Nucleic acid binder design. Structure first.
Length: 98
RNA sequence: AUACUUACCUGGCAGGGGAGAUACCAUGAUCACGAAGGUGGUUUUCCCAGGGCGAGGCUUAUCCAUUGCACUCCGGAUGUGC
């Protein structure tokens, strides 16, 4: 709930393959700012979710505001802030601890 | 039912993966203790020459469950071709 460099997106159609989904997520989410990375996994816990890491929290917040509910493969997108900083964020800040 | 002598009718020979290394067995080698090699084994490296074990791994659909906060690949089962 507290703004973050990374946004977390879930409730995605699970049929889409990892590389396809990363590609289309990059395409969809670049409109709001420079994206450093999009992390997707299809494991049991992680399937259906992606982390988009933006350079600025303001871009993250605006992407959340705009895309909240966006029709995506016949499903409304659910977006939250990441609970924790993404490793590449934490290393740029020097906050990272194993 | 068997063997013996004769006539007639049928029919192609050799074999059992191959090349190296064998200190050890057999051949108990015809000259005052002896062969080597070779031949037939046992041991030991390969072109892998065919098979058995299908663990592991690759490609893609079906079924069940998951709303999951990860950043060292990886949910369970069935089918097709390797």
């Amino acid at each position: 709930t507290r703004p973050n460099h990374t946004i977390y997106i879930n409730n995605l159609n699970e049929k889409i393959k990892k590389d396809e989904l990363k590609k289309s997520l990059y395409a969809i989410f670049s409109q709001f700012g420079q994206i450093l990375d999009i992390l997707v996994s299809r494991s049991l816990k992680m399937r259906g979710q992606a982390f988009v890491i933006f350079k600025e929290v303001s871009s993250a917040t605006n992407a959340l505001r705009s895309m909240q509910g966006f029709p995506f493969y016949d499903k409304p997108m659910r977006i939250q802030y990441a609970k924790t900083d993404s490793d590449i964020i934490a290393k740029m800040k020097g906050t990272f601890v194993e």
